[PDB]
Amino acid sequence: MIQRTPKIQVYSRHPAENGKSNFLNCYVSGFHPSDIEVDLLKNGERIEKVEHSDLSFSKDWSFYLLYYTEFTPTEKDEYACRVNHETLSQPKIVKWDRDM
């Protein structure tokens, strides 16, 4: 058996401009086993409004997932990716960093 902790990257499809329609992405990669919970949060609240995702498997025993939703960024809204996985002692919350 193998367990691997997920890598989590949160990023917008295009550079973020307030009031411009866009896509927010969570790429959750390199995790094992596949059991996982992933959500995008808008100021702490689960974004339900359509969710697309994409799962894949690499033969070194690792799963890869792209999770994304349409969003119009504003100055005041905070976004984060919330991930739970058995390798984590607590749910992991990774904030979207608009600038870096």
Numbering used by the authors: 0 to 99
The authors write:
β 2m deposits in joints, bones and muscles, lead to movement impairment, bones fragility and articular pain1617. The three β 2m surface mutants that we rationally designed (V85E, W60G-N83V, W60G-Y63W) were produced as recombinant proteins, purified to homogeneity, crystallized, and their structures determined at high resolution (1.75 Å, 1.49 Å, 1.70 Å, for V85E, W60G-Y63W, and W60G-N83V, respectively).
By calculating the change in the protein intrinsic score upon all the possible single mutations at these seven sites, we suggest that the V85E β 2m variant should reduce the wild-type aggregation propensity, while two alternative specific mutations in the W60G β 2m variant (W60G-Y63W and W60G-N83V) are expected to weakly (the former) or largely (the latter) increase the W60G aggregation propensity. Indeed, the score of V85E β 2m is lower than that of W60G, the one of W60G-N83V is comparable to that of the wild-type while W60G-Y63W is slightly larger than that of W60G. In particular, for the crystal structures here reported of the W60G-Y63W and V85E mutants a closed AB loop conformation was observed; by contrast, the wild-type β 2m, W60G and W60G-N83V 3D structures exhibit an open AB loop conformation. The comparison of the wild-type β 2m and the V85E mutant structures reveals that the mutation does not elicit local rearrangements in the FG loop where E85 is located, nor in the surrounding residues. The 3D-structure of V85E mutant displays modified conformations in the DE and C’D loops; however, given that both regions are far from the mutation site, these differences may be due to the specific crystal packing. Upon V85E mutation, the wild-type β 2m stability was slightly impaired, with a Tm value decreased by about 3 °C relative to wild-type β 2m.
